[PDB]
Design a binder for this molecule. Structure first.
Ligand SMILES: NC(=O)c1cccnc1
Ligand SMILES: NC(=O)c1cccnc1
Ligand SMILES: [Cl-]
Length: 516
């Protein structure tokens, strides 16, 4: 029988969790919250690799959510007295959801969720794994990792190599290998999954040599390792911005890192506040080479993967949160050329390419509303769709890739945002978790409940077998030379060669015009 207050072993000592959802489910869920997977990255461990967590005597309380990593709460709120929730540099914790029948040796598949938030916001407690664990009989782990300046500050040299947050994620995955059997998970059957910066994180583990053997499958929702804003060949803009805001100017790398280690949490938060996103670098430990080189390597051996995108990734929430929404509403045929020259610069293209962008996405269009929708379409393709299609192409010659486009505009958002918005950024997450953030219930239509049951079963079948297919689910073909992908909506359908024209434009036509 499941205990009300179950006690489990870890390498660092015993922990007590909770039994929940006994009434509204068959046989309930065990939660174990706030488990340390690394030593707190404070004092000299700020801008240093994660180190082994300390052992304890007695039974650790696993009934409270951990502190979130330091982040800008205004931005997290744009994405509720979040000021009452604990926030600390001491934030390297993970949460576990298990079916209440699980014990040492149950050998259930494990799914490890890596949250998004552009590597500057988010927390594990936002994602309640309870319904995924009970509906699909698996262990769900939600992890934290250092965010913003504390996660991704680099000097480009030995004093701060960078990618602290990715090293944290790998430390959490090593904890899962070491400990998950004590909670009834099979460490040989771990799937990493994540959305947006979390998808980028997952895709980054898929290429990182020191992450190999920490997982057996990968699910990348609306983000991969080539998401342009989250990967950089230079450390220079971030480090010079941080030196200026911190008052640690006119210092070498060694003195800059020493100066930044003396800063309080409040001083770090004030420096951190300007970053709406922060990139990973080629740090040498996590990425020995740029992800594009690792993906193209003849020695690349990716795990089986699901990779997918939504049909309106830049439709509403990203431009609103990033503060580009006002500029977009200002687009007309009169200023379009100037907007596309500015956009070309942000895309790291020559501003001469603005005419090619205009012809590809806007053509002869005059209507301002249509131009603004074409602009968001272009941004979504550049940031999410083309990178996803490129990574899927690099992987699928080595290992199974199942590709999806999620298309369903959620019923509960119809009155909250413009009616032209289709499946926005993050719209698929509640279909995978069968709940909104913090496990809050949603008024799904009957049709939406079926799409959620299907997506949960595809994901869990993939966690079990590296193949999403099973009886009663529409057949999802593996991605091969026919470029097949599953269109996820109320009536799922198979498509071929998603946005093949756009892929030709971005990967062949546009680089040819640049070469000239
Ligand atoms: N939410 C995210 O992780 C995100 C949003 C925009 C850009 N990159 C990442
Ligand atoms: N129509 C709008 O208000 C809008 C908001 C955000 C992005 N694009 C358009
Ligand atoms: Cl510790």
């Amino acid at each position: 029988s499941p205990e009300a207050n179950p006690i489990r072993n870890t390498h660092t000592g015993q922990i007590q969790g909770s039994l929940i959802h006994v009434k509204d489910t068959k046989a309930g869920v065990h939660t174990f919250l706030g488990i340390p997977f690394a030593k707190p990255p404070v004092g000299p461990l700020r801008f240093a690799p994660p180190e082994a967590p300390e052992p304890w005597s007695g039974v650790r309380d696993g009934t409270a959510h951990p502190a979130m990593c330091l982040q800008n709460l205004d931005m997290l709120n744009e994405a509720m007295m979040l000021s009452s929730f604990p926030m600390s540099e001491d934030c390297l914790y993970l949460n576990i959801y298990t079916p209440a029948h699980a014990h040492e040796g149950s050998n259930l598949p494990v799914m490890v969720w890596i949250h998004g938030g552009a590597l500057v916001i988010g927390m594990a407690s936002m994602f309640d794994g309870s319904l995924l664990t009970v509906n699909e009989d698996l262990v769900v782990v939600t992890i934290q990792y250092r965010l913003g300046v504390l996660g991704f500050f680099s000097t480009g040299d030995q004093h701060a190599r960078g990618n602290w947050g990715y090293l944290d994620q790998a430390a959490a995955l090593r904890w899962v290998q070491q400990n998950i059997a004590h909670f009834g998970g099979n460490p040989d059957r771990v799937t990493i999954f994540g959305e947006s910066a979390g998808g980028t994180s997952v895709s980054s583990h898929v290429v990182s040599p020191m992450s190999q053997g920490l997982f057996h499958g990968a699910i990348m929702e609306s983000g991969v390792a080539l998401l342009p804003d989250l990967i950089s060949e230079t450390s220079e803009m971030v480090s010079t911005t941080v030196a200026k805001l911190s008052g640690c100017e006119a210092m070498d790398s060694q003195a800059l890192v020493r100066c930044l280690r003396g800063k309080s949490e409040a001083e770090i938060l004030a420096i951190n506040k300007v970053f709406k996103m922060i990139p990973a670098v080629v740090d040498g430990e996590f990425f020995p080479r740029h992800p594009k080189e690792l993906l193209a390597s003849e020695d690349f051996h990716p795990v089986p993967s699901i990779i997918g995108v939504n049909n309106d990734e830049f439709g509403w929430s990203i431009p609103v949160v990033m503060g580009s929404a006002q500029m977009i509403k200002g687009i007309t045929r009169e200023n379009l050329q100037a907007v596309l020259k500015d956009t070309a610069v942000q895309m790291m293209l020559p501003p001469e390419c603005s005419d090619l962008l205009m012809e590809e996405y806007m053509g002869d269009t005059e209507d301002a509303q249509t131009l603004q929708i074409q602009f968001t379409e272009m941004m979504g393709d550049f940031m999410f769709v083309i990178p996803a299609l490129q990574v899927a192409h690099f992987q699928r010659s080595h290992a199974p890739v199942y590709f999806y486009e999620f298309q369903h505009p959620p019923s509960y958002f119809k009155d909250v945002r413009p009616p032209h918005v289709k499946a926005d950024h993050a719209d698929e997450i509640p279909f995978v978790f069968a709940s909104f953030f913090w496990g809050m219930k949603l008024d799904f239509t009957e049709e939406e409940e079926l799409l959620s049951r299907r997506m949960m079963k595809y994901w869990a079948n993939f966690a079990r077998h590296g193949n999403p297919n099973s009886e009663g689910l529409p057949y999802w073909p593996v991605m091969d030379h026919d470029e097949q992908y599953l269109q996820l909506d109320i009536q799922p359908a198979v498509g071929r060669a998603l946005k093949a024209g756009r892929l030709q434009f971005w990967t062949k036509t546009l680089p040819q015009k640049i070469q000239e």
